[PDB]
Motif scaffolding. Structure first.
Motif, PDB file in Angstrom:
ATOM      1  N   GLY A  48       9.641  -6.677   3.587  1.00 35.07           N
ATOM      2  CA  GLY A  48       8.301  -6.298   3.153  1.00 35.07           C
ATOM      3  C   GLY A  48       8.172  -4.876   2.602  1.00 35.07           C
ATOM      4  N   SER A  49       8.877  -3.902   3.182  1.00 31.38           N
ATOM      5  CA  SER A  49       8.848  -2.560   2.690  1.00 31.38           C
ATOM      6  C   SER A  49       9.299  -2.470   1.210  1.00 31.38           C
ATOM      7  N   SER A 100      16.763  -0.250   6.578  1.00 31.82           N
ATOM      8  CA  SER A 100      16.177   0.613   5.553  1.00 31.82           C
ATOM      9  C   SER A 100      16.832   0.319   4.188  1.00 31.82           C
ATOM     10  N   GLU A 101      18.090  -0.130   4.216  1.00 33.64           N
ATOM     11  CA  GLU A 101      18.914  -0.406   3.023  1.00 33.64           C
ATOM     12  C   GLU A 101      18.704  -1.752   2.355  1.00 33.64           C
ATOM     13  N   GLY A 126       0.748  -1.245   0.000  1.00 35.25           N
ATOM     14  CA  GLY A 126       0.000   0.000   0.000  1.00 35.25           C
ATOM     15  C   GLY A 126       0.782   1.303   0.000  1.00 35.25           C
ATOM     16  N   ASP A 127       2.096   1.253   0.188  1.00 35.72           N
ATOM     17  CA  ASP A 127       2.829   2.491   0.399  1.00 35.72           C
ATOM     18  C   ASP A 127       3.139   3.256  -0.902  1.00 35.72           C
ATOM     19  N   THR A 128       3.024   2.563  -2.029  1.00 37.99           N
ATOM     20  CA  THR A 128       3.173   3.161  -3.364  1.00 37.99           C
ATOM     21  C   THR A 128       1.825   3.707  -3.855  1.00 37.99           C
ATOM     22  N   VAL A 129       0.744   3.309  -3.181  1.00 36.85           N
ATOM     23  CA  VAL A 129      -0.551   3.747  -3.633  1.00 36.85           C
ATOM     24  C   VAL A 129      -0.739   5.249  -3.417  1.00 36.85           C
ATOM     25  N   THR A 130      -1.150   5.908  -4.478  1.00 39.44           N
ATOM     26  CA  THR A 130      -1.456   7.322  -4.494  1.00 39.44           C
ATOM     27  C   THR A 130      -2.967   7.580  -4.537  1.00 39.44           C
TER      28      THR A 130
END
Lengths: 74, 66, 77, 92, 77, 65, 77
Positions: D64-65, F57-58, C68-72
């Motif tokens: 997951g990120s 984060s990397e 969901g984090d790419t969803v705009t």
């Protein structure tokens, strides 16, 4: 105080800019503390309303909160 | 906190921000969240002169002296 | 509430804009508050600019989960 | 907590994973966590070009990120279950 | 052992930080917290690995670090 | 899901920028911060460090070689 | 005798403020309100993009500017 704003402009016509530059003009159906926004009768433009209309959604538009840079009334 | 900002009040500090901004100012105020109050703030982008600025701590990346 | 007005069109066709000139059209199976999505019968359009010219690519899938984090943006086509 | 629940029912099922940096990887879902991290057993190449610099590696951990997509089969998933569960979930 | 524990006991050692912008920071570690925010003394920062500013003390947000080279001494120290 | 089975083993790491590492995984936390030893550049086969700490984060991918 | 940042923002209420994002873009307007997250309400904002700089728009009414992207605040523009 920002919450008073959120309930003060519901039903009004707003511009919602996202990170990318894209701008959405519609009527504010709903808002949430995560900045998630619902609009109706929305159009997309890039940067300014005076620029070329890129889309007209006859349907309701959900804009993700993480992405919104402002919500502004006209 | 691990950095005692009190020893830096009324000195000139260098603050690098997220998104590649540089700011050198005189440290007037601070909070636990690393929000700063700079005076004679100069933002290096080559040179820009803002005055009494509030820096947000959430976007702060680095902090040195000057 | 805007996340509830999204339940409204579960099992209805949706249009999804993503980061990077990606677009998805699918039938809405599941979402959460993170915007994470599952779509069935979906086609994904990619607009690329290579050699200074514009092409758009396609990709079909019967079932897809979308971080969901790419969803705009979410609407209907 | 809902998509964690979703991904648990997919264990032992072959999935394709598309990472943001244009890497595509086929594998058997062995494990899932709260962040939606994934462990894939018996790694294999879907695309010639996108696929990265591996080989002996047959077991991977994916953050997951960094995933964009997880490609599924319509028979791996009861749609009505998904729908009624989303309807149940609360978002406030 | 955990990365954070490792850091907490490298206090007083020399180490080299690569930041997300490419800047390299050589210095001696003086403090760590649970979010991996650092403070180092006897500092030298570089615009990139190619290499030169000397600084007395630097504070580094942990979210900005790509990696931290430790001294080979680390395991026994 | 856990990196427990990889401890002390050699691993391939793909960073989010598509860069590649080879290393022995010694420590890890819940945010995927890694503690690595004898690190090398997969592509370059160039020795990077005897000990190194790498932010989560990397990381995009860790594989068990 | 400590000077608190949020007290400085509190004092600039009903004055002109410059708000600088972490991107090039800037907003100059009358500071109506702000919250703890530094979300911000502006009145009649001039929206800018910075280097010749093109002024994007002249807002009328009230803007809620997400404090998520705000890097700097300048009191009285």
């Amino acid at each position: 105080v920002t919450t008073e704003f959120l309930s003060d402009i519901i039903g009004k016509t707003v511009n919602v800019k996202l990170a990318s530059g894209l701008l959405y003009s519609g009527r504010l159906e709903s808002i949430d503390g995560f900045m998630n926004v619902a609009l109706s009768s929305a159009t997309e433009h890039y940067e300014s309303n005076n620029n070329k209309l890129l889309n007209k959604f006859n349907s309701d538009v959900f804009l993700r909160g993480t992405q919104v840079m402002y919500i502004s009334e006209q | 906190a691990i950095l005692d900002l009190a020893k830096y009040k009324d000195s000139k500090i260098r603050v690098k921000l997220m998104g590649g901004k540089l700011v050198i100012g005189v440290l007037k105020g601070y909070d636990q969240l690393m929000n700063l109050v700079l005076d004679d703030t100069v933002e290096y982008m080559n040179a820009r002169k803002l005055g009494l600025t509030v820096i947000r701590g959430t976007i702060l990346v680095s902090l040195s002296s000057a | 509430t805007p996340l509830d007005l999204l339940k409204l069109n579960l099992d209805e066709r949706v249009y999804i804009k993503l980061r990077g000139a990606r677009t998805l059209v699918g039938t809405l199976q599941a979402f959460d508050s993170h915007c994470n999505i599952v779509l069935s019968d979906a086609v994904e359009t990619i607009y690329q600019l290579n050699n200074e010219e514009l092409s758009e690519s396609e990709r079909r899938c019967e079932m897809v989960f979308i971080r969901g984090d790419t969803v705009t943006l979410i609407s209907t086509p | 907590m809902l998509f964690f629940s979703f991904f648990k029912t997919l264990v032992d099922q072959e999935v394709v994973v598309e990472l943001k940096n244009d890497i595509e990887i086929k594998g058997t879902l062995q494990s899932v966590d709260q962040f939606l991290n994934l462990k894939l057993d018996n790694i294999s190449c879907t695309d010639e070009k996108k696929y990265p610099h591996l080989g002996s590696v047959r077991n991977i951990f994916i953050r997951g990120s960094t995933v964009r997509y997880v490609y599924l089969n319509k028979n791996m998933v009861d749609t009505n279950l998904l729908q009624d569960a989303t309807r149940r979930e609360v978002m406030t | 052992m955990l990365p954070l524990y490792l850091l907490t006991n490298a206090k007083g050692q020399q180490m080299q930080i690569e930041l997300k912008n490419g800047e390299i920071i050589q210095g001696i570690l003086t403090n760590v917290d649970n979010w991996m925010n650092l403070t180092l003394s006897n500092v030298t920062e570089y615009s990139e690995e190619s290499a030169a500013v000397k600084l007395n003390e630097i504070y580094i947000r942990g979210t900005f670090i790509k990696f931290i080279k430790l001294q080979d001494n680390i395991i026994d120290k | 899901a856990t990196l427990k089975d990889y401890l002390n083993k050699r691993v391939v790491i793909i960073k989010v920028d598509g860069e590649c590492l080879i290393a022995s995984l010694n420590g890890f936390d819940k945010n995927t911060n890694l503690f690595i030893t004898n690190v090398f550049n997969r592509i370059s086969k160039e020795f990077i460090c005897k000990a190194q700490l790498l932010r989560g984060s990397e990381i995009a991918l860790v594989g068990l070689i | 005798p400590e000077i608190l940042p949020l007290e400085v923002i509190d004092k600039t209420i009903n004055q002109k403020v410059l708000i600088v994002l972490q991107s090039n873009r800037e907003f100059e307007g009358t500071l109506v309100g702000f919250d703890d997250f530094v979300n911000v309400i502006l009145e009649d904002a001039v929206e800018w993009l910075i280097d010749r700089n093109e002024k994007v728009m002249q807002h009328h009414g009230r803007m809620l500017l997400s404090g998520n992207n705000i890097a700097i605040l300048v009191p009285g523009g």
